[PDB]
Design a binder for this molecule. Structure first.
Ligand SMILES: Nc1ncnc2c1ncn2[C@@H]1O[C@H](COP(=O)(O)OP(=O)(O)OP(=O)(O)O)[C@@H](O)[C@H]1O
Ligand SMILES: Nc1ncnc2c1ncn2[C@@H]1O[C@H](COP(=O)(O)OP(=O)(O)OP(=O)(O)O)[C@@H](O)[C@H]1O
Ligand SMILES: Nc1ncnc2c1ncn2[C@@H]1O[C@H](COP(=O)(O)OP(=O)(O)O)[C@@H](O)[C@H]1O
Ligand SMILES: [Mg+2]
Ligand SMILES: [Mg+2]
Ligand SMILES: [Mg+2]
Lengths: 523, 539, 478
């Protein structure tokens, strides 16, 4: 049974020829009797052996590459994922109902690529690069691969520039950097899309104020969301004007599993154009836990062995090689940046899930949104004891850095006291005082939705709480007391604080002057 | 001569040879590929086919692509030419500074040092961290585990360990970045360019650190073998040069994680929670090479990421036995604001032995752990009763243990750029007496918060001075401070006039540098002869 | 036999048509093997070493013999690996003979009732959780709680007792190191050659870099080397440190051989694996020689979770249990023996009769102290019946403390428990401890140790002088 006599059979040992000269002149008249049942043989083209659930097993296709775009004869595209010895496993970029057994598969010659450039700036796109907004094809745009390797050690530099988000809980406690990956994680309906959206709106508000090179081009990747939500987001971004700087990559729930798998890579490739051409990009991978689910389906139907919660083994590499493309390049590469905001939905606050722990270990910071802080009025529901950022200093406003340390410390003073709120002994009027300031700080940190704040009006508002100026009011009207503060302090303070970056010693003087000049309605 | 690609599934390539198969762990080169793709033979499939893991991405591989055998495992440059260089998993320079001029390229695969060449001496590696040097003291020539979840301070602690030990060590250090962020690898590289550990240009030979990097963007084959590359650089520095080596490995967990991502594609049915069946033996074959022989010495510091703060997860639980010292970092300690967030109880070392470090150091460490365990047992009844009835023996052991908890914290030199407070180096006899004083009761008159984020015991009794001066302020509030405009300050409108006005372009620069190529509306396929044709309109 | 496929230390071998299950084979590269599962087309061979030297088409020769190790008195003092080959660099093994690693455990009529004690030198173990010769006692606990410390104290105390007994009742220890670090087991041979305990100690050592069949076979090799002493009328002491690592190595071999996995991917016969090993620790009858083999398996739990698979298996197999807690360890109680969770099914029938009359009050006082242990951290003092037990048990838990690598003879632990359960202990204020704990054994005259060791009992002609000598204790430090 071993290969040595099996190779000896290649040498002829027939010793008689009373069938060979009989059937060799009988074979070709027999085969010609069935030539309309024969399909033509295939070598460099392909032919579908089996199709089902979005996977085509393709016979032939001798010279395909791994990860290569293929195109079926019915027009629907594909992607040669696992190249096995007798067939190619092709995932279908679309509905696989137009694929039959025996359909011809054509190799396109290209690894999968999307159109990148300034022409995508303003369009609503699918996960493969085609525009779905009904405004014609993509013009002033060029094709680029979706599997670019992330820039290495010598290509990067240290993250210094802020990229404020307009959410003062974020910009005060979890300060983002301009090339930093920050994970927004929480349960369902806890305000993660709200934080990413307010970040995009604040980049629209800041792009009409900075000189042409600190301008931030947002890219929103909607993975697995329904199409009504994406249309509502396009309506929001057009009615506020944020669509002039925003690209939207939309692989919805009706799309195929490889389209939702590939849409964060399409959005990252579209956002890497601004990173590589010296501009600054912002990429939001909304529902990265749905891209992992689409990848799980795509790999389970390719009959790869499942792992934790039936995910692939390489589902860490899926998000690591995606998120590591968010970098801040060196000056010889342009100095451009790309900052990622991946979103993970947890189940009942279980942070110890597989995809959640993987993306926590990948990204720099964390933004935790608890559903018990959400229903206590704290909006955004930032879990201040769990939301971490790697940069801390040297990535926020220098004015905010002087003020938010006394916020970070005193919220920690508030949290270690409030676990003794069943008795109320009010020890030496000190444990009473620190909660009576921390409740003011948590009520200060609340804000509305789709209304981001400039950073100067945030660091004035935390200046009015880390100092005095609000100890005279109840905790029920600080969301109106800070409106009284920003509305009645003279707006020439904000211009000086924006142009300086920190509070000059002539500016904290005038700021302490004008925070008693205002009439706050807190009684 | 050569073999051909038979099957590509993910990062695992099956290569078929016609006679003279390569050995297991041999290196195979793929030619015709765009980048240099190195495959390492994992197993023999059986019908003249080997199964391999790739060191770079397998996107682009064709079934039938020519794969040539090297006849040897992955060989990397080792020696003095690698000092101050950044290497790949396969030994290429990725610092973009010429080639690596090092002689005697070594295989990354060898067996462990055998039993007779094992050193038994135990000298304390003083680090300057008064929770490390007191409770779980490190051993020079020993293996150190930095456990802890995501965000608790493993990389900051290993940065401070580099900045304390590796600058005043004399011998060479090796950093092995195994599956971590490329940003912090660039941060380490920059911070050792400035501090003089790495030098560039003609004075390259005066460097004391070799970087080997296998970060998170790499495929799981390149993260599974980069620890062997850093380890064989350290093994050349230990065996041949005879030196005493430092081997900092950031996240040795990613070694087991990278071996887990390929093990289902290697044909192995999964083990417990989702790791490979070969978890303990792969970790043992890696870690037993990191030893102190009779030839030289390797002092290894290893960060171990525990998944979701679970110390019972099998990938750190396997790591626990291979270590001399163990510095478990806890999230609940960092939630108190205490940094470094070392668990004072759960951290363990072989040096905590009265026959090794002395019966003063050992007894004061056991006393600190005793009073901290007593306070941890009292933390239940404090939250139900209120710490008012405990009759001055359990009310004193709360205050003493709280002063000890604040006194275990320490400002780091590498943490000045996100805390502001300057870093402190606290020596061993200088922390034993400082903890013995707060243990015996020499510092009950001091305030409790005065112990927080200081250095020696000659800093808590100065923070008490500054705290009692600063509460001696905030006393009077009539006038004469900055807010009255008469001192030196202009009007609010005149400070506006000091602003330089910036330009605004409103065209964003998107029409002058872009090569706007044309993309076809129709789709373009390749026919049987390889020629480029449009898609044939017949479904 | 021709190698079909090789990988992960498993060689699928065509041919070897008459090979036995569990038989040593030999490869072309000199590396050994074991025919583990014999299939209709090939043989699944586990490789004793690194399989990178085996190729497809390599010739596999069978040796005709099941896996055996050298046993005998020449194994004493020698550091062997998991297959009996020496690794201490002291030349080849003289004065030995080969015997199989997997021998059937002795049956019912081969047994005898476990009556004579095995003293560990740890007074918590010797007083509360006693061991008999021929017993299987699980040392279970979390990491870094002192399981190896209890095992090494037992070995060192067997060396200390071996000098004052005749040739017949001498205990010869075997330490099996399964999956440990190789620098850890050089510290142990340094400590055994420093204390003198290497004269009676065989040390089997399959380290972490060893192949998984070597770690799987190291407890059986150690049990064969100890069964040499059990079978010839002498007494052995076998210690499998981290049996939960041998289980992991067997899980690796079973999953790489594609045997169908069960709970936590362990095979169906992992209970059979551990029971085959631990049932070979017996107390033989006087017809077979009267030899004994006492086993101390070590199982590392995770967070006190004794509801794991391997932990419940070895708990179901073994006689007793020594549970070591993490929170007792940092509380000063070292050895951190959980007195409530440590069982001994042989019990009081195999302990010192001098200890049997004095530790019986001790375990009841400690159980009463455990029932009232919530009252200890209260300020308003209670009805003075619970204060009496809360002071008595809090001093008795201080009497069970012990430093490392200094085991105590049983006649000294007996008088130390008699000095504390009879009310003689430090009833003055307890800042006099260091000049009060060992002041009893350093100030009472050593004749009473000779009488208590020789009679084995606190006779009515001895307790009078015991109370007399315990009343005239000096304590000169105050
Ligand atoms: N700052 C805020 N103030 C008031 N309401 C808010 C705020 N942020 C979010 N919300 C409300 O919370 C709800 C959930 O918001 P959002 O969609 O951002 O959460 P989500 O986690 O993305 O939800 P899903 O998990 O369904 O995608 C929305 O209806 C929104 O109105
Ligand atoms: N009775 C004791 N007195 C003082 N120290 C002890 C005692 N027992 C153990 N230790 C210390 O506890 C540490 C751990 O001990 P040991 O190695 O015996 O536990 P282990 O459970 O075997 O640990 P591991 O699981 O890591 O092998 C050792 O460093 C030892 O010095
Ligand atoms: N010694 C320290 N002092 C102050 N902050 C620290 C310290 N160590 C860690 N941190 C905080 O923890 C964050 C993450 O720490 P890091 O070293 O990245 O841990 P890990 O590598 O385990 O994620 C840092 O951004 C820093 O703010
Ligand atoms: Mg959402
Ligand atoms: Mg890290
Ligand atoms: Mg041990």
């Amino acid at each position: 049974a071993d290969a040595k006599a099996l190779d000896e059979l290649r040498k002829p040992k027939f010793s008689s020829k009373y069938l060979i000269q009989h059937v060799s002149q009988k074979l070709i008249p027999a085969v010609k009797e069935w030539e309309k049942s024969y399909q033509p043989p295939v070598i460099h083209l392909g032919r579908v052996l089996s199709v089902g659930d979005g996977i085509a097993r393709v016979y032939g296709l001798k010279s395909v590459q791994a990860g290569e775009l293929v195109c079926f004869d019915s027009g629907v595209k594909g992607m040669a994922l696992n190249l096995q010895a007798d067939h190619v496993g092709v995932v279908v970029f679309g509905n696989d109902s137009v694929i039959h057994q025996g359909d011809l598969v054509y190799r396109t010659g290209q690894i999968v690529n999307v159109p990148i450039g300034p022409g995508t700036l303003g369009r609503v796109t699918d996960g493969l690069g085609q525009p779905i907004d009904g405004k014609g094809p993509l013009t002033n745009v060029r094709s680029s691969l979706v599997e670019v390797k992330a820039p290495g050690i010598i290509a990067r530099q240290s993250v210094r520039e802020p990229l404020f988000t307009g959410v003062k809980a974020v910009d005060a406690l979890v300060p983002i950097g301009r090339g930093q990956r920050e994970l927004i994680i929480g349960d369902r309906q806890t305000g993660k899309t709200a934080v990413a959206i307010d970040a995009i709106i604040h980049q629209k508000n800041c792009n009409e104020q900075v000189p042409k090179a600190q301008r931030v081009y947002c890219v929103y990747v909607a993975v697995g969301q329904k199409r009504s939500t994406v249309a509502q987001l396009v309506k929001l971004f057009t009615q506020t004007g944020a669509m002039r700087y925003t690209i939207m990559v939309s692989a919805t729930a009706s799309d195929a599993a490889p389209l939702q798998f590939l849409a964060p890579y399409s959005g990252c490739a579209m956002a890497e154009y601004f990173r590589d051409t010296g501009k600054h990009g912002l990429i939001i991978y909304d529902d990265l836990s749905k891209q992992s689910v689409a990848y799980r389906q795509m790999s389970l139907l390719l009959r790869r062995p499942p792992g934790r919660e039936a995910f692939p083994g390489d589902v860490f590499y899926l998000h690591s090689r995606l998120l590591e493309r968010a970098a801040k390049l060196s000056k010889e590469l342009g100095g451009g940046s790309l900052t990622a905001f991946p979103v993970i939905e947890t189940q009942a606050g279980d942070v110890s899930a597989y995809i959640a722990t993987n993306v926590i270990s990948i990204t720099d910071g964390q933004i935790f949104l608890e559903t018990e802080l959400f229903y206590k009025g704290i909006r955004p529901a930032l879990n201040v004891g769990l939301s971490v950022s790697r940069v801390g200093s040297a990535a926020q406003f220098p004015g905010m850095k002087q003020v938010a340390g006394t916020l970070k410390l005193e919220l920690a003073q508030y949290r270690e006291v409030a676990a003794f709120a069943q008795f109320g002994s009010d020890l030496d009027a000190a444990t009473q005082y620190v909660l009576e300031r921390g409740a003011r700080l948590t009520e200060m940190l609340k804000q509305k939705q789709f209304a981001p704040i400039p950073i100067e009006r945030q660091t004035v508002a935390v200046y009015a709480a880390t100092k005095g100026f609000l100890d005279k009011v109840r905790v029920q009207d600080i969301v109106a007391a800070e409106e009284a503060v920003i509305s009645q302090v003279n707006p020439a303070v904000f211009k000086i604080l924006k142009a300086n970056g920190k509070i000059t010693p002539a500016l904290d003087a005038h700021l302490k002057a004008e925070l008693r000049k205002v009439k706050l309605p807190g009684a | 001569d050569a073999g051909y690609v038979s099957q590509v599934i993910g990062p695992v390539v099956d290569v078929r040879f016609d006679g003279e198969l390569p050995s297991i762990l041999s290196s195979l080169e793929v030619e015709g590929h765009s980048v240099r793709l190195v495959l390492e033979v994992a197993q023999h499939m059986g019908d003249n086919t080997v199964r391999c893991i790739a060191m770079d991405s397998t996107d682009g591989l064709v079934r039938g692509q020519k794969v040539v055998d090297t006849g040897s495992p992955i060989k990397v440059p080792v020696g003095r030419g690698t000092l101050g260089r950044i290497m790949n998993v396969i030994g290429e320079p990725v610092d973009e500074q010429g080639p690596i001029d090092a002689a005697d390229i070594w295989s990354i695969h060898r067996e462990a040092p055998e039993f007779t060449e094992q050193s038994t001496e135990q000298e304390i590696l003083v680090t300057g961290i008064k929770v490390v040097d007191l409770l779980a003291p490190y051993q020079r020539g020993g293996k150190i585990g930095l456990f802890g979840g995501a965000g608790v301070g493993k990389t900051v602690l290993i940065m401070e360990l580099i900045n304390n030990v590796a600058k005043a060590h004399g011998g060479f250090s090796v950093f092995a970045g195994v599956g971590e962020r490329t940003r912090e690898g660039n941060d380490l590289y920059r911070e050792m360019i400035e501090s003089g550990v790495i030098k560039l240009g003609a004075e390259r030979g005066n460097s004391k650190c070799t970087l080997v990097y296998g970060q998170m963007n790499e495929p799981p084959g390149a993260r599974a073998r980069v620890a062997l590359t850093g380890l064989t650089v350290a093994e050349y520095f230990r065996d041949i040069e005879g030196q005493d080596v430092l081997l900092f490995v950031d996240n040795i967990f990613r070694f087991t994680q990278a071996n887990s991502e390929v093990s289902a594609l290697l044909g192995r049915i999964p083990s417990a929670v989702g790791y490979q069946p070969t978890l303990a033996t792969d970790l043992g074959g890696l870690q037993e090479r990191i030893t102190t022989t009779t030839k030289g010495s390797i002092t290894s510091v290893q960060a171990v990421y525990v998944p979701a703060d679970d110390l019972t997860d099998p990938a750190p639980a396997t790591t626990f036995a291979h270590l001399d010292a163990t510095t478990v970092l806890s999230r609940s300690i960092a939630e108190l604001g205490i940094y470094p967030a070392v668990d004072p109880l759960d951290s363990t070392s072989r040096m905590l032995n009265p026959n090794v470090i002395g019966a003063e150091h050992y007894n004061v460490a056991r006393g600190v752990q005793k009073v901290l365990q007593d306070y941890k047992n009292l933390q239940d009844i404090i939250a139900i009763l209120g710490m008012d009835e405990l009759s001055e023996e359990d009310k004193l052991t709360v205050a003493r243990a709280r002063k000890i908890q604040r006194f275990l914290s320490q400002p780091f030199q590498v943490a000045e750029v996100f805390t502001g407070t300057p870093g402190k180096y606290v020596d061993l006899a200088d922390t034993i007496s400082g903890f013995q004083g707060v243990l015996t009761g020499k510092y009950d008159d001091l305030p409790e918060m005065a112990f927080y984020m200081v250095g020696d015991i000659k800093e808590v009794k100065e923070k008490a001075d500054k705290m009692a001066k600063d509460i001696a302020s905030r006393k009077e509030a009539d006038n004469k401070k900055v807010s009255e405009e008469l001192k030196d300050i202009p009007s609010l409108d005149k400070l506006v006039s000091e602003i330089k006005e910036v330009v605004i372009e409103e065209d964003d620069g998107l029409e002058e540098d872009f090569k706007a190529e044309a993309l076809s509306s129709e789709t373009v396929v390749l026919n049987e002869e390889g020629k480029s044709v449009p898609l044939p309109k017949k479904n």
